């Protein structure tokens, strides 16, 4: 089934009644854009009897008119958002979806939107008979390089000049979030009269509705900058952080460490950044960071990152804030070297 | 306040007015009766706020003015468990309503009334006075596609529409739809008007007999009924929602007029181990002939075989054959005279002293 | 189905139930005195005689006698009590029951008097299971329940039972059972039932009771299902897989040999035949404690370690004591950490290995 | 499982018994369910409720049995877990319990079976206490676990248990042979991994668990020398990762024992292998570690949000930290 | 298999027995009715797995081997919806048993007859029979002491024992029980026979003056019963059926003879500002009048004074109003002595006039 990028979903909607337009996709700023695209030119298409009816996981169903004559006291053809399960139709769903496939579908225009299908959902028989009429628009994200590209054109959604300057700093920190970067540039446009971006004016007032995510931190930790990273994580505090989130993007950037750490000693840094993973401009904090951080020093710093971890998820300790500011220093070892009692 | 009443005068305003109360709906207090000595009368009321319900009750009998106000079942049932005719001699002694029978007291609970809020008088628009039976003959023959709840906007209560001389209802749920309509001769500026559906009722319930010549004043907000002692306004959603016009079979070529009944009693048997679906029969009928196939997803069918009067294109037109019956039955009619369109569209169901008295479904296969 | 002998071995009388004088006395005491609570709270280990002391006591409230200290045995009402049906008596599992709302219904019957009975008696056991609200709500009517009704509370434990209930209670608190106390009512049982008993099994039995004369009655019956007919020691022995061998001892020394092998290729079979490794540790341990005993005094011991007496000695005085607590200790540990082993037999190979490290 | 051999003669003496009514109505059957116990417990079912008709047979005939063939024998249940949950709630229990207050509905015994007792939930077991303990009229009720281990013990207070160990590994193996091929050695490696139980031996060779057994071993004899375990995360980290951390601990131990001196091994499926731990790792540390391996596979159970990943890494590394020196090497205890 | 059957004949035959069918988890053919025209009778069974209602049809009509088992109702509505009388021919044919009565027809499914779990029914011996005129009291007074969810007995179930040439049955929920009492039996023995809640009702429903009288072979086994066209055969619960004697109020004595009707009214209206959870009202019967004080906890207050030749003292005892009224009705017997122990203690209440019914609750709170 054909894909087709949100900003593109014009092409197959207008040029034909797509069935099923599936915007399995996840950016919700994707998801929410593919969306009102179809309902309003399928609204406008007559077809403004419009209802949402999610599909649970549960079987459900309802309305499974699509054809029948019924109507004449109130005839047309109605439109049927389909908010998916998690992976999506499951069974009766499938099924269910299935004979939609098999029917004029009419007066239930499908606007099934949602995440991406299992596969075997995609290849369940009503994943099978919608396409080539439905439409799927992958409603998926930048990575962290075509987030500016992206960044900028939707600069000029706010028209607003913006600063790529801004963008960056923006595609960075808010480097996967189109949608609260979206509307960060709503509110500070608002905030100002002008409304311009600009990377100075982004900083006198940031939005308050967009996160500095982990990699402030964990970054600052990169670069050994234990101190920086410390900072960050005041900031994280404040801002009431859940720590199993921490955790888990720090654990994320720390066995990504030790396995190019292994790696790394002997491979040149930050093409590994990205030959993996690890921003850009973190490539060069993490390039560092395996010739800081030693795969041995690093070992004591892992056992007590684990010991955090269960500290927390088997026995909801919620110490695990001060058991960082020892890890932080074990794990750096300071930007230098400085590896402790755990704790 | 202080009435003494015959458990009977009294009873017929122990229902019109206890009934929608009952259910102590809304306020408390609004699930409570009035009880109104106000003068030799005692009214009762009990207002809900959706509809209302006053009964009136002459009291020359012991009385005391003042009022209270007690809820709907408490008084209710003891007066009505109470024998018949039963002087029922009721007094607001304090906060207990001392409930008097005659040798067995009963102590309700009662609050003097002093709040109990009641609904906008206003001056009807259109009023005019029902010959009663004008009211069921639509009423009846019309409510089988009137939504209880209809998303659809108040389907949910009828649609109201003065026209002219004619009174016109229509239900529709949006596959069914009626019309009835009979004239009244009470030129009526016209108008539709969403009365609530608990109005519907409870005027069908003060509809009364004994050609209780109803009055009825529409107004767009209130509406105001006058049947007996039975004062019922309601407030009125004014609106509308479709009519029948468009509804109407395309073609209205194929007739069939048959027997509600005979065809009542095809559709009923015909309705048997039919489809679990959709009600979904699909008639293949002749020119004579009308001959339903209807399965079931049960691979059970019934087929039923009658005559018509059959017109037009015997054609297979499938029909949710619950809709079928509901209205056939209300209806009252013996023929019922359909015009078919061959299934894309509604059939005519009508009364045959449809005065116009369309009644209108749409196909639905099995 | 086929008939037990726990049940059909309680009490009628303080006798049938061996110890927990405080009780029985704490029991014949109350029942025959004014001083009868509508709020017991037998707590003892399951039918240790936590339902025991219950019986005796309905038997004496519904004694149509009265309130006896001893349940004057017959009275239609005594027993009946015993028996189905007896509308005085009602008795409750509060264990099928987790529901409050099963604690609800329970409240609202007490009303209804007896057409002929003397005292509404209720009687829950296991209410432990019972939700909280289930708990909270019973403190209602433990201070002032309509009369007749009573609230024998016999628990397991009132733990899962709050401290205002056990406030509101008289809680006679059953104490546990020796295993002589036990070996001894069980030999006194077994005995009168025509197969033979067996006097190891007894033990093997007295011990095994768990402190309960509930099992220890139901151990029995069991045991003769499976040697179908007559309690042998062997039978029971095996049943109980129960090592009456030195092995212990044997596995400790080989341990002290530094003996790997032996140590274990011996616990593996032993697991094909899934022995257990518990009777085979406590054991272990006896010895090393009593060693050290003897080295104390080998004889101011209370040691029964006396078959290995010298044995004891022996060690005891050639193994610094402090050594002996090491012993003693590590596979203390190691016991302690058995069963965390993904294989049974796991933990306890690494109970003796470490062990086997020391040397 | 199945019906095996190694489940007629517990059933006959307990058919006996029960035909004897000495032969109390409960039983408990230790073996693994996995080793038989449930085609075994539903055998007789299969008489009891028949009204345990003729002497002893698994019953093929009768009414009761084929009824209950049918299973529309309502004396007859099966009484699995509840699948609202996957437990055998006290609901499900509550129900087929009071169904015996009514007597026998369509005669024979009942019998009344646990699939696997194992199974049971706490208000469900609360609720069975009195049921089993006091025996209704024609029940005879029949449970199975894993092990015993798998019940409470007020319950088996009143279970009349019928052992009911694993068949011989000799013939658990022979019996596990059958059906995988591979290696006795791999059988066995793995029924000895299993405890000896069969039933529990047989899963191993299925999946790529026992492949993965293999290949664990592999890049683990990589991983010892070279103090990259970090290289075993994966051949361990499975949805068996326990299981594969089961497969790898059986060795740890085996290292332990060449550390007592000891030629046995539980994983006879490379001895080589065995040595280089013990070899590598003074045992201080492979004892420490061998602990650790289960504690892993018990965590990757336990804690709950746990990165099976992070925790399967971690340990890598740290075991290459104690490969280093100066980094403390324990031994097991407090 | 093309089994005629007379529609009519049958058309009582499939009521009686789909009363009695399924209600069990399990229930598919419990649902389906077999027949087999036998050629005479028919089977006409209707298994709960717990009692049966087997209706024959006496009829001739043909028959060719069709034993089968359809859904219950399909076809009997069926029957009905095609004209009586009508002879109602089938061919059983690929589990498609089709039923053609006229231009109605249709095609119903069939489960065989093979699996039909079926239940007891066997010649029971003894054989002993009541009129279902009293038979009738006898269950009336005594089958609304049902009460369920028992882990202990039969409370919904009743017994049958014939102490002597009477029968005394017993059914009780533990807090009223009703034993009514039928001279007329035989001495001819007892049997465990207890029924359950369900059967008693359909046998009731077997009596009425109608039916046949009422005859039973008391068999511990099942027993056999004849009313109807039927044949209702229950398996027993064997088990005991809790006491009887003892229930009645120790020394039932004071004699309160009302009249049950007066009473059962004067009781209805008590109760309602009475205690409003069980309905236990508490009664101080002023003597040889009465006198009534109930509350509602819940403020309220109902009196009455009625009378009730009642010496001895006032009675002073409070039961579950609920409870009685159900006996007062159960009674047919209009005159009904109470013999109370005057005293919040248990109250018998037995028809004064005869004794048949007699009937004990227990009173409320101490």
Redesign the interface.
């Known amino acids: 089934m054909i894909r087709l990028y949100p900003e593109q979903l014009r092409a197959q909607l207008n040029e034909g009644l797509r069935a099923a337009y599936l915007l399995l996709g996840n950016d919700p700023l994707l998801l929410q854009e593919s969306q009102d695209a179809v309902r309003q030119v399928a609204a406008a298409q007559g077809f403004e009897e419009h209802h949402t009816f999610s599909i649970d996981p549960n079987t459900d169903w309802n309305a499974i008119f699509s054809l ?7 005839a047309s053809r109605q439109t049927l958002l389909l908010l998916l399960p998690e992976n999506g139709p499951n069974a009766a769903i499938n099924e269910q979806l299935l004979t939609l496939t098999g029917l004029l579908h009419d007066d239930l225009l499908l606007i099934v939107r949602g995440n991406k299908l299992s596969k075997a959902q995609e290849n369940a028989a009503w994943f099978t008979a919608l396409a080539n009429r439905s439409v799927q628009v992958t409603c998926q994200t930048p990575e962290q390089a075509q987030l500016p590209r992206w960044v900028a054109a939707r600069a000029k959604q706010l028209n607003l000049e913006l600063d790529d300057a801004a963008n960056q700093v923006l595609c960075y920190c808010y480097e996967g979030n189109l949608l609260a970067l979206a509307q960060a540039l709503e509110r500070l446009s608002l905030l100002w009269p002008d409304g311009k971006l600009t990377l100075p004016r982004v900083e006198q007032a940031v939005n308050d509705a967009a996160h500095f995510t982990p990699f402030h931190w964990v970054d600052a930790l990169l670069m050994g900058k234990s101190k920086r990273a410390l900072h960050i994580l005041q900031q994280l505090r404040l801002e009431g952080s859940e720590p ?1 989130i921490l955790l ?1 993007t720090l ?1 994320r950037e720390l ?1 990504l460490l ?2 190019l750490k ?1 790696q790394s000693a002997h491979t040149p840094l930050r093409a590994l950044f990205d030959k993996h993973r690890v921003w850009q401009n973190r490539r060069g904090m993490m390039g560092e960071a395996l010739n800081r951080l030693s ?2 020093q ?3 710093a ?2 007590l ?2 010991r955090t ?2 500290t ?3 026995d909801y300790g919620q110490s695990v804030w001060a058991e960082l500011e020892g890890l932080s220093l074990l794990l750096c070892h300071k930007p230098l070297a400085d590896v402790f009692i755990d704790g | 306040m202080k009435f003494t009443v015959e458990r009977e005068h009294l009873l017929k305003p122990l229902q019109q007015v206890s009934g929608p109360l009952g259910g102590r709906p809304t306020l408390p207090i609004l699930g409570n009766l009035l009880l109104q000595v106000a003068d030799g009368t005692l009214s009762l009321t009990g207002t809900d706020l959706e509809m209302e319900m006053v009964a009136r009750v002459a009291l020359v009998q012991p009385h005391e003015p003042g009022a209270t106000t007690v809820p709907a079942r408490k008084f209710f049932d003891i007066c009505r468990g109470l024998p018949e005719g039963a002087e029922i001699a009721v007094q607001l002694e304090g906060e207990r309503m001392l409930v008097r029978s005659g040798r067995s007291r009963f102590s309700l609970s009662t609050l003097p009334a002093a709040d109990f809020p009641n609904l906008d008088d206003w001056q009807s628009e259109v009023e005019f006075t029902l010959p009663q039976a004008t009211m069921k003959r639509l009423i009846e023959a019309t409510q089988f596609s009137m939504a209880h709840q209809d998303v659809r906007y108040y389907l949910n209560g009828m649609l109201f529409e003065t026209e002219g001389e004619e009174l016109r209802t229509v239900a529709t749920d949006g596959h069914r739809l009626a019309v009835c309509s009979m004239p009244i001769g009470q030129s009526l500026p016209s108008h539709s008007v969403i009365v609530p559906r608990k109005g519907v009722i409870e005027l069908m319930r003060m509809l009364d007999g004994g050609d209780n010549p109803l009055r009825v004043q529409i107004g767009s907000n209130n509406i105001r009924a006058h049947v007996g002692d039975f004062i019922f306004t309601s407030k009125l959603v004014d609106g509308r929602f479709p009519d029948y016009r468009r509804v109407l079979p395309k073609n209205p070529d194929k007739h069939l007029e048959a027997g509600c009944d005979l065809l009542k009693q095809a559709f009923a048997r015909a309705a048997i181990l039919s489809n679990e679906k959709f009600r979904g029969v699909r008639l293949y009928v002749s020119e004579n002939q009308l001959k339903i196939t209807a399965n079931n997803p049960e691979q059970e069918e019934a087929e039923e075989i009658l005559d018509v009067t059959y017109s037009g294109a015997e054609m297979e037109i499938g029909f949710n054959v619950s809709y079928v019956l509901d209205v056939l039955n209300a209806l009252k009619c013996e023929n019922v005279r359909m015009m078919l369109t061959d299934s894309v569209s509604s059939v005519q169901i009508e009364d045959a002293a449809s005065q116009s008295a369309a009644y209108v479904v749409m196909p639905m296969r099995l | 189905s086929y008939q037990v002998l726990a049940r059909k071995w309680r009490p009628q009388t303080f006798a049938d139930v061996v110890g927990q004088e405080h009780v029985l006395t704490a029991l014949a005491n109350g029942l025959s005195l004014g001083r009868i609570h509508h709020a017991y709270l037998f707590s003892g280990t399951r039918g240790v005689g936590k339902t025991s002391i219950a019986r005796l006591l309905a038997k004496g409230l519904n004694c149509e006698t009265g309130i006896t200290a001893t349940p004057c045995g017959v009275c239609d009402n005594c027993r009946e009590i015993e028996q189905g049906r007896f509308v005085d008596l009602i008795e409750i599992d509060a264990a099928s029951r987790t529901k409050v709302e099963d604690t609800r219904d329970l409240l609202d019957n007490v009303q209804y008097a007896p057409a002929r009975g003397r005292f509404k008696v209720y009687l829950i056991d296991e209410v432990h299971m019972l939700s909280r609200h289930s708990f909270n709500a019973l403190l209602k009517t433990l201070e002032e329940p309509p009369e007749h009704v009573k609230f024998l509370l016999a628990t397991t434990d009132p733990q899962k039972l709050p401290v205002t209930i056990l406030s509101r209670c008289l809680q006679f608190h059953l104490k546990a059972l020796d295993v002589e106390q036990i070996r001894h009512q069980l030999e006194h049982i077994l005995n009168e039932e025509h197969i033979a008993h067996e006097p190891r099994a007894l033990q093997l039995l007295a011990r095994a009771a768990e402190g309960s004369l509930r099992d220890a009655l139901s151990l029995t019956d069991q045991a003769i299902a499976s040697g179908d007919g007559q309690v042998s020691t062997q039978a029971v022995s095996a049943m109980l897989g129960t090592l009456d061998d030195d092995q212990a001892l044997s596995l400790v020394e080989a341990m002290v040999e530094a003996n790997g092998e032996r140590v274990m290729a011996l616990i593996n079979e032993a697991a094909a035949r899934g022995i257990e490794w518990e009777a085979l540790l406590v054991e272990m341990l006896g010895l090393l404690h009593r060693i050290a005993m003897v080295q104390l005094s080998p004889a101011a011991l209370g040691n029964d370690m006396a078959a290995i007496e010298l044995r004891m000695r022996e060690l005891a005085r050639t193994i610094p004591p402090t050594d002996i607590q090491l012993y003693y200790q590590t596979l203390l540990i190691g016991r302690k950490e058995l069963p965390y082993a993904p294989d049974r037999r796991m933990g306890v190979e690494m109970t003796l290995l470490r062990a086997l490290a020391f040397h | 499982m199945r019906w095996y051999p190694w489940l007629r003669p517990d059933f006959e003496k307990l058919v006996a018994s029960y035909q004897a009514g000495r032969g109390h109505h409960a039983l408990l059957i230790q073996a693994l369910p996995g080793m038989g116990d449930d085609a075994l417990i539903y055998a007789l079912s299969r008489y009891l409720l028949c009204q345990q008709p003729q002497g002893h047979k698994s019953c093929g005939h009768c009414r009761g049995c084929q009824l209950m063939q049918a299973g529309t024998h309502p004396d007859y249940y099966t009484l699995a877990p509840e699948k609202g949950k996957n437990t055998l709630g006290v609901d499900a229990v509550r129900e087929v319990t009071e169904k015996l207050n009514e007597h026998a509905r369509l005669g024979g015994a009942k019998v009344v079976w646990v699939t696997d007792a194992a199974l049971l939930t706490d208000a469900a077991a609360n609720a069975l206490l009195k049921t089993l303990e006091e025996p209704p009229a024609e029940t005879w009720f029949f449970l199975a676990t894993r092990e015993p281990e798998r019940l409470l013990a007020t319950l088996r207070s009143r279970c009349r248990l019928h052992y009911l160990a694993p068949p011989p590994e000799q013939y658990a193996v022979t019996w596990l042979s059958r059906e995988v091929t591979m290696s006795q050695d791999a059988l066995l490696a793995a029924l000895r991994l299993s405890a000896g139980s069969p039933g529990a031996a047989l899963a191993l060779f299925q999946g790529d668990n026992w492949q993965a057994r293999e290949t664990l071993c592999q890049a683990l004899a990589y991983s010892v020398p070279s103090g990259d375990w970090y290289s075993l995360l994966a051949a361990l980290n499975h949805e068996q990762a326990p299981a594969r951390l089961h497969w790898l601990a059986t060795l740890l131990m085996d290292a332990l024992k060449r550390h007592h001196g000891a030629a046995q091994v539980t994983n006879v499926d490379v001895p080589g292998l065995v040595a280089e731990l013990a070899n590598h790792l003074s045992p201080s540390r492979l004892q420490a570690i061998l602990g650790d391996v289960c504690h892993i596979r018990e965590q990757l159970m336990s804690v709950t949000g746990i990165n099976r990943e992070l925790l399967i890494t971690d340990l890598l590394l740290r075991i290459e930290h104690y490969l280093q020196p100066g980094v403390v090497l324990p031994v097991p205890h407090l």
């Open positions: 029948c004559q019924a109507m004449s006291l109130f199993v888990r654990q066995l030790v396995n292994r795969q041995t690093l070992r004591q892992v056992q990152l684990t971890e269960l927390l998820k088997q």
